[PDB]
Each structure stands twice: as structure tokens, then as C-alpha cells.
Target: Glutathione S-transferase 3
Amino acid sequence: AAKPVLYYFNGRGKMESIRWLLAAAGVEFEEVFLETREQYEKLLQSGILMFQQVPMVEIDGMKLVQTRAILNYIAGKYNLYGKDLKERALIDMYVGGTDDLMGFLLSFPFLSAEDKVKQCAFVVEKATSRYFPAYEKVLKDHGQDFLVGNRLSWADIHLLEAILMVEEKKSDALSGFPLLQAFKKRISSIPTIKKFLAPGSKRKPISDDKYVETVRRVLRMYYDVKP
Amino acid sequence: AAKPVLYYFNGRGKMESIRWLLAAAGVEFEEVFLETREQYEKLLQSGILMFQQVPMVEIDGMKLVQTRAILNYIAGKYNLYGKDLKERALIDMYVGGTDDLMGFLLSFPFLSAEDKVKQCAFVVEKATSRYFPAYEKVLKDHGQDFLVGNRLSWADIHLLEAILMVEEKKSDALSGFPLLQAFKKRISSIPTIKKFLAPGSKRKPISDDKYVETVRRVLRMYYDVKP
Model:
């Protein structure tokens, strides 16, 4: 092995969460961006994408595909997946919820101005009435700084990312969830994470129109993404 | 703990895969079906559905939500998840692909007759040009009876289910994938699985119109599911 290599577009997408996890773990990685269609075609005939898709990560000799497979592997390898099955079930449960929440924003940059507005509210309602109350309760019920095992876990990292994403759409969306507001502070303060949030890191920005173009050109898809 | 309880509609949905896994493991379970809207409302105020959704499974004291969390827990608990992280990464990768494939059929019973036809072909193309060739290669490359660790794993079980589902739409879809045809035989023969495929088991049938009705009534959603 050597240093993890993340193959994906130069933007957030489904790769962002993996960037977050590797960073929180203090793991340095290299990225190979998809800019041209010929590049993609070359990658396909190569046959290193088991199911003809990205994300794809070369780590410890393997060339992994399937976002959840990759994240799972990373959470286990760097001891951010709990101590046993019970603790891992909780982490998967929480991660599941923030994944669904984040999943509602995947197509956002591909929506029309009219849809972006409609989707924006949809996601805000989802987070404030469904997700945030659930995670707020987890913290309340055990009163510990972390979601699971009183120690940083993938779940915490995934939750933080989801929080900042919702806050990029509705800056005060977290208002009324004191525990998450304090959670947002604590987690954002952990050195590795703090560095990732800092300037010059590999954290990717909100996807703009160039991102969409590069995607539509290389994959020849998502031309008419609906809300 | 006691005996696992699966809360969900009396049909396939996202619960089917969990039924398959628990059965392959020789685990007996009880089911509580969602038939009325008031039933759902009662379940909600109860607050046992962390994110206000089903599937939900009560197992070993926990009330788990998030399909993947549940399956993950079940695969680990009954030693159908590999021996280490490397083997588990492979299983997650394979499962990921059959999950995406099966994911394309979730809304099928809610489609119009015109869409069902369109979706049917879409899924067939997906399985024959993308998925089946990939899994065929895994078997070819190591020439072992199982996908991972030369022993039955969740991945094998998930693959079989996906095969039979595609075959319920295009009976000869597996034609040209000798290795999967032999894989289909081997796996279908394992006693626990063989019993699940047999008559009188809890395996659920292809969702009909009554299924759709019961869903639309209890959840008040999926009224206009698009292709």
C-alpha cells in the first residue's frame, strides 16, 4: 500500500463524505479528478471500476467502489466504528439518517432555479422536524459529548458534515437544538477536523455550474434532473 | 432478547432483503404488518421509529431502523460478514452493487403500466451489461463456489435474491452467465435458503396492487411514482 487515491470529479458529490472521514482520521490522500469524457472512457476500458462507476478509491492495494463500502472500510480501519456490533449498529443507524438527509442534496446543483428553492425548503423541513430532533435526543438521553461510546465515531463526523450542509442553505436551521449547537462546536474543534475546516484543506466547496458542466460532459447524464 | 420482530408492510419493499438474511442464517422471526393509517400514527407517537420510518426491527433489545444498519448488524452477528476488514470491504462492495440493482425495482409496483414496461427493460439492461458481468468475473477469477472467503457470506445471499428478482422480469436474463447459473443452483441448495425458497416460508411475493394500496393508505405517499 501507500497513500489513498480518490478518483472522482473535482467537487463534492458522493466523494465528499469520504474526504471528511479520511481527514478526521488524519489520513493524507491524493485525488485524481475527472475532467474529460475520454478520460472516463479510458478509465472504463481499464476495468478498474467494478460496476463502471465512481467514487473509486485505491487504498491498501484495493480499488474500492460503492461509497458505503469505502466509508465502512475507512471507519473500521481507523477505529471510528465502535467497539462491538451493538455500538456499530448504532453508528450505522445514525449514519443512515444523515446519509438520507445529505442524499436529498446530491442533485441540488443540477436543479433549475425554481427547483433549487423548492428543494431547499424540503430539506430544511426534513432536518428540523425529523433528523435534528432525533440526534438532539440521542445527546440529551445520554448527556455525553459523542453520539456513541463517549468517543469520536464516524457517526459524529457524518452528523457534523450534514449540519454544515443544511446550514449552507438555512444558516439558522440549527436554532432550537442547543445540544447540536454545542456538538457542532466540540466536533469542529477536534484538531484533525479543525484542520479540514480550515483554509487550504481538501474540503470541497458548494458545487457550482462548472461542476455540473464537468459532470454532464464526462458522464453524459443528469441533463434534466428533477426535484 | 428473544425472537426478532420485523415491522413493515405485508410485502417485499426494503424489508425483503432482511427476511432473506435472517432466513439464510436459520433465524426465526415474527412480523408485525402495517395495514392501517391509525396503526402508523400510533407507532409514530410511540417514538420507537428514530427517524419516523420503517423497516424497523426489534432484535437483541434494540429497535433498529435504517435497512443497511439492520442488515449489517445481522450479517455480523451470524458470521456472514467475512473474517476481517478486507473481506468485509469486498462483501460491502458486492452487496452495494446488488443493492443498487434491486433499488431500481423498489418503485416498480407503483408505476403505470407504460412505465413498468420501460423500467422493466432498463433494469434488464443494467443487470446484463453492468452487474452480471461483474459478478460473473468475480467467480471466474477465483473459481470458488462463493463470492468471498470460499464460504457463504451475505454477499452471496444478496446476489441470489437480486438474480431471482431480475428473473421474475426477464426469465432468461441470466443466459450467458454460466457461472452465475451454477451459483444460482449452489446457493439455492443450501438448506436454510432452500427452505426459504420452499412453500410456506415467509418469503414475500411480487408486490401486487393491494400492496400499493396498503402503502398509499398507511403512509399517504407514493401516489405518483415516476420511472
